[PDB]
Structure formats: structure tokens, C-alpha cells
Design a protein around this ligand. Structure first.
Ligand SMILES: [Ca+2]
Ligand SMILES: [Ca+2]
Ligand SMILES: [Ca+2]
Ligand SMILES: [Ca+2]
Lengths: 597, 597
């Protein structure tokens, strides 16, 4: 095999917070060599050997005195010599202080294969294992970075300020490569999406249009076609010695006073599925590898933050160290973990600042708010319930369990669950209530591409393909084009208009970003809440019934303080508030009022 | 009124912890009097008058040097003189240190009107507003203290060590008097049950049989026919000026960062129903009255603890002081509050030792475990779900939210919910799982009278009458008699025998009372858990499927440590454990093993 086949990370930076840098070098008999270098400020620590002759780990300490530049690392032995020109880049100004996504932002989520096909010629790349098939629900359809860049003005125009694509890193599988969650090369964009440089350009073009770029990272597992699997770096690189042993998904076992170690180990070491080998993050070489790789992406691509897949499936102690390291580099960053639970205590456990019964500590800033999303979907779909909205109110009342509930990501939907419009029973009026809720809660809102034109799916069970249909207009020849509005129905257009109206409005509402929330217990499926501060009040009121409802306003006086009326932002009409609030069937109002003293 | 009509409390004790005693005196123009007394150790505090001429509140300070005996309190004014001979009783040896019910106990619950009619002559009492009607689901059927006493041998024989009857205090309503939850006289047993002296004898007779007596108290409300309602002691004695203003039951409002004062006030001040005037516990006279009355019952009747109805419907600050006062008098007491929520965080808020986000402090030792009861009822009823027992496992994993989860009361059922057997879909095998669960969890188990012979009810909604059918054998002429066994089906008898077998066994298993618990995540509706300490392991395994299941025992080796087999306590069969555990359809086994090294 090639001289040096992989050098990882391939370059680094001067002036990082953490001085240490561990290079993973791969090439035939490279482990039989000895490394050497000469550069002021950089110290070579000295080999800690591994049994595999095809890998060498090189431990560097990059002092604060080390300057941007480059130097040769020279590997000598077996009467031969290999070189690698190592570069230490200068950091962009303000790099460490970069502002992560937060309450003022709204995130638009895409799956890059399913959004826009800007270059059909990369749909297939010579040498790769899967051929594209737009007619297969689990196939590659051909979306790419060019297509995403082409439509950044659309996304910004809709009122979004962050872009979250599901993973773009190489997934060279024979089938189901499209989704990105089984990496085969952590340091390379899948060529079907474009180049590493194209991904950097995506970040720079998004930034020009006022948008941050949030990368989707998997830490727990890889794809079985990862080049590591051909020649395991160490016998314990992959959990269970590289052999498939399935997890049974007992997520509470890592945070349960009654837990069996068998179940905790099975959660964090168990293979998610057979095609997804599980990384042993208890091996410090694996821990360092992932930590450095994610830092490399943030620094190289100028990311505003990360979304961290399958969060608790990684080793707990690794997660503590990983979050500490990432947040030490980038103190203002945001990272949002995916803890798939509808139980607030389960999600809350992972957030930075939480006092845990077992002393578990974390620097993770954010989690996906599955409990609150589930609650609202139940309320809007179970329309025969007298007071289904009570589930939302009670779930929200548990916010004290989170150190920073305002930093959680609330979403209309995502690529793993029923389409937002379908979850609302294709009821446009109830869908409006969900959208208003999303845009007014004390959360960071996230929206899934395609929901703005009411794309539908199955609702029963798990049906990935139905949640991931191509965006209309992303492909040459499409009869309808949501980017231009061509071929949309009046209802689809009304949806898109409302998203654009609300998201753009939200950008300019500090009271939503950091004001207080006071909500009232729902009664007969009507719900009133306020966002407030001394400058502004926003009153949201929902009537989740197919009959009109009238709410005496005496109930709300600690918020209304005698306000006789206010203008509803949705309709532009003045709404009476002096003695009663008259709500039409299936209505929602967003009443804007002066400050609360 | 007639001279002194009511004096409350009517007598007290020398040597209580709290030296202060506040007497609430009622009678025609008694407010116009001034009190005087002379007794060593007893000081009369200078009067604080109320505008109502028919009440006088007399403040005493009873020093520790006050001996048991009696003294006249003289009431002078308007040229007349009224007397009351006040008695200070000597307390029983060990009174303050009385052991409250705990993890080693098992509680049998009854409704006194529905258990045993020992004396048909007191079914009606001349003067009372309701006539008995055994055929009316909401009528008085005639159960009484005599009947309860008659069958203490039966209750103790089943293995129970505590008796909890729903309230026996006077309920002189025109309708629905039977349930006890609308007191019309807090210092008097309803004459249809018997006398105050009979209640004392119930306690002493239970004690002779190794059983404690737990009284059911209502703090938040009274019945509309309470004598206070004829002539309100103060204008603010009852919330909302003594007029009906309903609560809307927003329980989370007292414990929600986003709460409106309108909602929290509505929860604690709002009338439960029109027939239940709400006590204003923010009036110190009302607070003192309740605290003193409940302490009076404990000291007078020799109670082992209290069960506190409608827990959060009382004022939060009042509850802190009430629980403080009671636990100060009796440091080892247990009191179990009824917070009707299936949400662990909502129940846990109230338990002594909890660090609450708002700084709320409580001295309440125990609560009813509705979340865990709800979880198991879901698992057993939802026979279409692949792994319903996961709900129980995950609920249990939340026990770290409670300061003392082992002090919580877990129950098979009660008078407010569907019958335990009906909740199990009348599936004897699933019922057995529920019963084993109840008897082996780290909890205080409580059992509802009638469940031991598989009494059934409706399943949906709130249908009180259905849950409260007469105990078979309680009435002369009954053709099914659970006390003697007459008329029971084979299955009903087997249920009864199993309750006896497990409850008596449990009394002798300290590992269940204070052992550790390790549970395993359920898989395909099979579940394995262990109670363990240095002395014993008790393994529970259940197969909630109508097909057999084989579980490899490699999984459970941290608990099994190579045990080849064990004997199932239930069937008495040997159960293999070497390499696989073979479970019959719908089975539960209970296996005793020696303690681990
Ligand atoms: Ca393409
Ligand atoms: Ca893992
Ligand atoms: Ca009777
Ligand atoms: Ca109340």
C-alpha cells in the first residue's frame, strides 16, 4: 500500500486552546518507523507504539510560541524515509470567540441528497459503491452542495439564520449511502456532494447571507465500509473486537440508580445496526481522534455549531471530555445533542450546568426538545380530547429541570418523524397553531425543509423514505418549484407565506429571544400565553376546537393590566380584550401589546 | 348557641413539643367574654378578638412544667360568667417517638361504609340528613366501626400491618355522605360509624393484632353542611368570602417557573366542587385549627400516621408549617400525601428533602406513587404493545428525583380508580405480575379491600360507585363471603390465598424492605429484576406475552454470578438458570438465592 495513505488531522492551527495534537498516520509499515521534526514551539513527545505495523500515532505539543507555518515530519527506519509537509495555519480573526446559534436564530434543516441537485454530473462518482436512483425511496437522488448554495437566498429570504444539513462526510456504502449517518471517511466530504473546498464555500456563502452553518456529527459509530475496517488500527478500536453485537437501546441505563452495567455497556458499546460498527471511545486514541476531527471541521469550515447525532450512544466519560474540549476551544459555541426521549428528565440530564444524582457532568449547551414537540403533536392530532393542550402546558412547566431551557432546540419536525402537516392531520388551521407555537416559545426554533409547503408522509410506525421526499424545484424538470412558487397550490403557498412572515418577524423580536414567558393552564383546549418584558408583550391565544370559544379576560389581568385591545399580527385586525377574548373555530391570534412595567 | 357550644380542641396534653395551644370557643355572645384561668405552668395570652360575637379564640402557653390535671377556664362579660373545665392529659409512654408506617409494612385500605356492617341499628341516626340505601351506588350502605373491628383478624391474617380507612369524621350531607371527604365536624366520628371512643378502640384492637391505624385527613375543604357555614367564624374563614368559586385544577401552577398567580391561587383557593367550601389556610386561625385537630387525632387515637387527601389543593406555605408541626411532634411518623399526577417531577416536588428550583421546603415523608401504578397498569393492559413493561422500567429509573423513593406508597388500586383485576383485563396471570411487583418493589405496598378476591369494575373515566362495591361477607345474608370463603370461585380463592402467601412472606423479607434494586431493561415484554443485599437475592422474572420466552442468562450475570437454578416461591417449581431462563406464557417467578459475596 501507498507511502503515507492517511495523515489525520491533515493540518492544524497555531494558537489553539489545547496544546496537544495527536497525529494518526497510516501506511504500510509506518509503525516500524521513527518520526522526527524541527519547528520552533512544536515538541515531539516520543512514540507510544501500537502492535499494528501499519499505523503510527505521533504525539505533538504545540506551544503558545509556535507560529503559523509548515514543517516536515520525517519517518525513518527499515533503511527508508517518508516525509509529510505539516502545516500550522493562522486562525481567522475572532475564531475562538465565534458566536454559536442561539435564541435569536432560526434553523433550516435539509438532507443534502434530497434538497437540490445543482450538478447532475456528481450524482455518480467513478469508483464508489452505489449508483444513484431517484426513483428509490432509500436511494441517492443527487442533491449536492452546488444545489444548496444555489438556494441560499431562498432560505435566508424565508427568515432562517442557520443551516443544518444532515451529514455530508463520505458514506461509501453499496446501499442507503444517501443519509450520511455511516461515515467511511471522517475527513472527506462525499464526492457526490462536492469537495472539502465546496463545503467551506457553502459556509462562506451562507455567512454572506447572514446564515451560520451547523454540521451534523456522528460520534458513536461509522459505516462498515470505512477504510479502518480493512485493517483495524488496534484490536479494541471497534467495540466487541470489531464483531457485530446489537444494542437493545436501554438509554436510561446510563442515568439510572438501579442500572445494570450490562445495560449501560450495551447502550454505549452496542452496535446500532450491523452495517454501523461502534467506536470504542474508552480507547484514548479513538477519543482524541473524534475530538480533533470535530474541532478540525469547526475551524476549517467556519461552523457556527454542531448537531450531535445519537448522543447517549457514546461513552459517557468520552462525552464529558469531548464537550469540555470543544467548549474550551469555542466558549460561545452551541452544540445540540440528539437524545431521543419524550421524558424531560432523560433529556435534561445532558445539558451543561445540570446537577446530576450520579455527579455526571457535561458541557453540552443544547438538546433537541422531543418532549415538547411530541406534546404539541398529540394536542393537535387528538382533536377529540376535551383539553389536549394540557399536555403541552404541563410539559413546558417542567422547564426548571433544564439549566438553560431557552437554549434547547424546538422543531416543527425532522427527517426521523412524520411530516409536520401530516402529524397535524392535514388540518391547516391546527398546523398554523403549531407554527405560531414554534416561533414564539422560549426556545431556538428549527424547521425541516419541505414543511413550508405542507409536504406529507405516513404517520404510522417508522417510514424514513416518506419523510425525505425531494424538495420540489431541486431537480431539473420538476413540474412544481417551491423556490420560485411555480405550481404550488393556494394552500401550499399560504403555508410558505406564513413561514416567511413569522420567521422574518421573529428575527426582530427580542422579547421572543430573551423575554419572560407566562402561560395559563389550558381550559377546554384553549390556551393563552405571553412573552413579555418592559418593552413589549406578545399574547398568543389558540382555540384548538371546531367551535367558537370565549375567554373572560379578567383571568389574564396580571399580564394584560387593563389593555383594552391589541393588533393581531396574523390578520392585522384589532382584537378586543376589555372583558373577553372571542376566538373563532380553530383560530390562533398573535396580539402585540406595549411593554409590561 | 347554648353557653359554650363547641370547645376545640376539647382537651389537650401536658408535654407536647409546641407549647402554644389555641382554643376555638363557640357559643352565643362568647366573643363578648374575656377568659381567665389559674393553673401552674399554663399562661393566658392577652386576647386577640374577631368581629364575630359568637366565637372567641383563646391563646394559651403550656410550659413543660404544667402537670396533667384540669383547670377551669372562666368566661366573663356583660354581667354573666361561663365556665369550661379544661383537661391536660398525661401522654402515653413513647408517644412522641411512635414508629410511623414504613417499608416493612403493608397497608390494607377500606371505605368504612362499604366494608362491614357490624351494627345495622346505626345505619340511620335520628337527626341526620341522609337515609341509608344499600342499592344506591352513591348511598350509605351501613358499614361501621363495629364491622371493621369484627374483621381485624381477617386483615392481619392476610399479612397486612396497617389499616387505612377513608375518613370516618362526620359528613352530615343530604346526599353522598358515605365517602367521608366533606367533613361537617372535624372532632366527631360520624354517628353512623360509631363514637369517638369506638375509633379509639379500633386503634387499640388493631394494635393488639400487630396493625397500625392510618387516618385519612382532608385539609383543603369541608362539606357545605359544616356548622361553620351557618355563622362563619371570620369573614375570610372560607376562600372567596364563603361563596363558590370553582378550581380548574391547574396543579402544576404551584410548581411552574412560568406560572400565573391567577392559576396558583385558583388551585389552592378554588373550590374543589360547589359542595366543598375551601378553607382559607392563609388565615393563621384556620392553619392552627387544622394542625391542632390532626395532632389531636394522632394523640387521642394512637395513630401510626396519616394519609393526606388532595395534597396540593392546600396553601403551600400552610403545608410547610403543617408538616413541620406534625413531624416536630412525632419525628418518626409517616404521612402520605395524595398528589394526583402520573408525572414523577410533580409528585417528587412535595417529598421531604427535595431541593426545589423555587426553594419550596416540605416535611412530608411520603406520597402516593401514581406514576409507577399508572406505568404498570399501562404495561399490563396494552397487550398489543411489543414491550409495554419498558414504561415501568423507565418510570422506576426516575427514582433519583425523590429524596426517599423507598418511603413512597405503591398500591394495587384504590377507591378512585378501576379495580386492580379490571385494570389487568381480568387476566389472572397478568394480575399475578402486578401483585408480585407490588410486594417486591422498593416501596411501601398498599392494597385496596376487595382486590384480594378479584372484585371488578368499569375501566374508563371516573366511575366512583363501581370501585366501591360492598365487601362480600360484610352484610348479614351475603351469599358470597370472603371472610369465610363461602361462595368464592376457585380463582377468587386462589387470588386470596396468593395475597396471604406473598404479604406474609414479605413481612419476613428485610431485603425487600431495605435491600438494593437492580433491574434490567425489558425486552419484548419480558422483565428481570433483583432485590439484593449481603444476606439474600430475590429474583423476579416476568413474561408478559402469551407465548413462551427463553432468555439467555449471560445477560444477568452481575446478579446471578453463576447460580445454576433456584426455586420459584410462587409455584414451588425449580427454575433453571445456567445458560437460559425458560419462561412459560404469562408467567412470573420469584426466586430466592443466597446473598452475593
Ligand atoms: Ca448531484
Ligand atoms: Ca456507541
Ligand atoms: Ca351499620
Ligand atoms: Ca384549597
Amino acid at each position: 500500500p501507498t507511502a503515507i495513505e492517511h495523515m489525520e488531522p491533515p493540518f492544524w492551527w497555531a494558537g489553539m486552546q489545547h496544546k496537544g495534537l495527536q497525529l494518526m498516520v497510516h501506511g504500510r509499515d509506518i509503525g516500524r518507523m521513527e518520526a522526527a521534526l524541527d519547528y520552533p514551539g512544536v515538541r515531539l513527545v516520543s512514540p507510544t507504539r501500537v502492535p499494528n505495523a501499519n499505523y503510527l500515532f505521533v504525539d505533538l505539543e504545540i506551544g503558545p510560541e509556535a507560529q503559523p507555518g509548515s514543517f516536515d515530519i520525517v519517518f525513518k527506519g527499515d533503511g527508508r524515509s517518508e516525509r509529510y509537509r505539516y502545516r500550522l495555519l493562522a486562525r481567522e480573526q475572532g475564531s475562538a470567540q465565534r458566536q454559536g446559534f442561539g435564541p435569536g436564530d432560526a434553523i433550516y434543516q435539509i438532507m443534502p441528497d434530497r434538497f437540490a441537485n445543482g450538478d447532475p454530473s456528481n450524482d455518480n462518482v467513478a469508483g464508489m459503491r452505489e449508483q444513484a436512483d431517484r426513483r428509490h425511496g432509500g436511494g441517492r437522488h443527487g442533491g449536492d452542495i452546488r444545489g444548496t448554495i444555489d438556494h441560499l437566498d431562498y432560505i435566508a429570504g424565508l427568515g432562517f439564520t442557520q443551516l443544518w444539513p444532515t451529514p455530508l462526510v463520505e458514506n461509501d456504502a453499496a446501499a442507503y449511502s444517501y443519509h450520511g449517518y455511516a461515515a467511511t471517511d471522517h475527513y472527506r466530504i462525499d464526492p457526490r456532494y462536492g469537495s472539502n473546498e465546496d463545503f467551506v464555500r457553502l459556509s462562506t456563502e451562507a455567512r454572506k447571507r447572514g446564515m451560520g452553518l451547523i454540521q451534523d456529527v456522528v460520534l458513536s459509530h461509522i459505516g462498515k465500509h470505512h477504510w479502518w475496517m480493512k485493517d483495524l488500527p488496534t484490536p479494541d478500536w471497534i467495540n466487541y473486537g470489531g464483531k457485530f453485537v446489537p444494542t437493545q437501546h436501554h438509554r436510561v441505563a446510563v442515568q439510572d440508580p438501579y442500572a445494570a452495567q450490562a445495560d449501560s455497556e450495551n447502550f454505549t458499546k452496542g452496535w446500532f445496526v450491523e452495517g454501523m460498527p461502534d467506536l470504542n471511545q474508552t480507547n484514548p486514541l479513538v477519543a482524541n481522534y473524534l475530538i480533533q476531527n470535530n474541532i478540525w471541521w469547526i475551524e476549517y469550515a467556519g461552523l457556527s455549531g454542531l448537531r450531535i447525532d445519537t448522543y447517549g450512544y457514546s461513552d459517557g466519560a468520552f462525552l464529558t471530555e469531548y464537550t469540555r474540549r470543544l467548549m474550551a476551544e469555542y466558549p460561545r459555541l452551541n452544540m445540540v445533542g440528539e437524545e431521543w426521549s419524550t421524558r424531560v428528565p432523560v433529556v435534561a440530564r445532558w445539558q451543561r450546568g445540570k446537577a446530576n444524582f450520579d455527579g455526571y457532568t457535561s458541557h453540552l449547551p443544547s438538546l433537541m426538545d422531543f418532549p415538547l414537540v411530541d406534546a404539541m403533536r398529540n394536542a393537535l392530532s387528538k382533536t377529540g380530547e376535551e383539553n389536549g393542550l394540557n399536555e403541552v402546558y404541563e410539559t413546558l412547566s417542567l422547564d426548571y429541570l433544564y439549566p438553560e431551557p431557552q437554549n434547547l432546540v424546538l422543531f416543527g419536525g425532522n427527517h426521523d418523524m412524520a411530516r409536520m402537516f401530516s402529524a397535524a392531520g392535514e388540518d391547516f388551521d391546527r398546523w398554523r397553531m403549531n407554527l405560531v407555537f414554534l416561533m414564539t416559545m422560549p426556545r431556538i426554533p428549527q424547521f425541516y425543509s419541505g414543511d413550508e409547503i405542507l409536504m406529507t408522509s405516513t404517520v404510522k410506525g417508522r417510514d424514513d423514505a416518506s419523510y425525505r421526499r425531494d424538495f420540489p424545484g431541486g431537480w431539473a424538470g420538476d413540474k412544481a418549484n417551491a423556490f420560485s412558487g411555480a405550481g404550488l397550490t393556494s394552500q401550499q403557498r399560504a403555508a410558505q407565506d406564513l413561514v416567511r412572515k413569522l420567521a422574518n418577524w421573529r428575527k426582530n423580536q427580542p422579547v421572543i429571544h430573551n423575554g419572560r414567558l407566562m402561560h395559563f393552564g389550558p381550559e377546554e383546549n384553549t390556551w393563552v400565553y405571553f412573552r413579555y418584558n418592559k418593552d413589549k408583550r406578545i399574547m398568543v391565544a389558540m382555540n384548538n376546537n371546531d367551535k367558537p370559544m370565549t375567554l373572560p379576560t379578567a383571568r389574564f389581568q396580571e399580564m394584560l393590566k387593563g389593555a383594552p385591545s391589541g393588533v393581531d399580527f396574523l390578520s392585522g385586525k384589532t382584537v378586543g380584550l376589555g372583558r373577553e377574548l372571542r376566538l373563532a373555530p380553530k383560530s390562533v391570534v398573535v396580539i402585540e401589546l406595549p411593554g409590561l412595567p
